[PDB]
Design an enzyme around this catalytic site. Sequence first.
Site, mmCIF file in Angstrom:
data_model
loop_
_atom_site.group_PDB
_atom_site.id
_atom_site.type_symbol
_atom_site.label_atom_id
_atom_site.label_comp_id
_atom_site.label_asym_id
_atom_site.label_seq_id
_atom_site.Cartn_x
_atom_site.Cartn_y
_atom_site.Cartn_z
ATOM 1 C CD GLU A 12 -18.719 2.126 -9.219
ATOM 2 O OE1 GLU A 12 -18.756 0.968 -8.747
ATOM 3 O OE2 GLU A 12 -19.708 2.698 -9.724
ATOM 4 N N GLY A 16 -14.138 0.147 -2.286
ATOM 5 C CA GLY A 16 -15.579 0.248 -2.146
ATOM 6 C C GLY A 16 -16.142 1.452 -2.862
ATOM 7 C CB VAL A 17 -19.603 2.699 -3.310
ATOM 8 C CG1 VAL A 17 -20.202 3.644 -4.321
ATOM 9 C CG2 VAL A 17 -19.961 1.244 -3.641
ATOM 10 C CG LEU A 76 -10.057 17.405 -1.128
ATOM 11 C CD1 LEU A 76 -9.499 16.197 -0.367
ATOM 12 C CD2 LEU A 76 -8.958 18.348 -1.582
ATOM 13 C CG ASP A 120 -2.575 0.193 -5.716
ATOM 14 O OD1 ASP A 120 -1.925 0.210 -6.789
ATOM 15 O OD2 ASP A 120 -3.790 -0.095 -5.689
ATOM 16 C CD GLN A 124 -6.834 6.167 -11.079
ATOM 17 O OE1 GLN A 124 -5.718 6.501 -11.499
ATOM 18 N NE2 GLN A 124 -7.257 4.908 -11.094
#
Lengths: 287, 70
Positions: A12, A16-17, A76, A120, A124
């Site tokens: 997540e 979104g997912v 990836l 941003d 991650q």
Amino acid sequence: MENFQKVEKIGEGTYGVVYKARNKLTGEVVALKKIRLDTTAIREISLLKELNHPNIVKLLDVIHTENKLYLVFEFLHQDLKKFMDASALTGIPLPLIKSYLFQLLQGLAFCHSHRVLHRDLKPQNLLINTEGAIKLADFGLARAFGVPVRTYTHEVVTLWYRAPEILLGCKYYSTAVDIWSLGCIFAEMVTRRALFPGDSEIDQLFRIFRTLGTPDEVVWPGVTSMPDYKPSFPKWARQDFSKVVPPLDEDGRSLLSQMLHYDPNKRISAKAALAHPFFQDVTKPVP
Amino acid sequence: QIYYSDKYDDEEFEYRHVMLPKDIAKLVPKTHLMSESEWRNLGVQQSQGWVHYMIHEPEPHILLFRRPLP
């Protein structure tokens, strides 16, 4: 959207997912991101399919179907957060770290030349593969969606990598915000922990000040023009980087120092960061 | 509730910040620095000497306290 089979949920994001999928036509694995579009933004992100660079996660296609927007992009296996989580008892070899930052600055340098920012940037959205490569994901999505205080699964977003100008209320902010976020990611890749992990926007600012010294007109000309600057902030002095980031060499410290410069105007650019002495011996070892 | 931050210092001051819950936060006026009696009234338990010296506008629910050293 009917061409994507064998769909498994990977995780997540803050939008979104994310799924791992299979293209029925080609037989390749792909990644999808289902951003629930409840209420131009699509046509603009489709244009991001035109920005290709070996260090920019490939945006294969954008698909809009009944209140859902699907980003089909290059697959990836892991991100940098997970990779650093797993390398906690050994860290990351300096050569790999030098290789990663180098490739990260060529992707930033590419996107910035096209006036595309990330704003941003977090470990991650930094994706790795088994061949020693690292790529940037989610460039240009923030200037369509905007990045929020809380996510879609209401998780708390990361302040840790925000530039000081964003934090002090600057409305007219640079592409130098990305160089800041990347300078934080660099130190973290080196120490395995966030350089400035604040619990609020003000704590994040104080965190920055404790390490880098409290900004003033000397170190940051025009800092008094920031909407949220107060002459009563705690007064700290710039700490010695040989202490803050111990493993890093003088060239590694010099660059980190320049990527972390207070004044956005004086802050090194991706282009000039690439010519820095630190990268004189860059290799490309595997993860 | 009410989160009390770790104390932190500089050359002549000692500090700490307190984060307020949504309820208590509706009782703190817009751009107003408080007196002990005023913040103590909000529920903030703290020693005497702490001064509400600053307000970070974007997060008006965080009370920033200062106190001179030693």
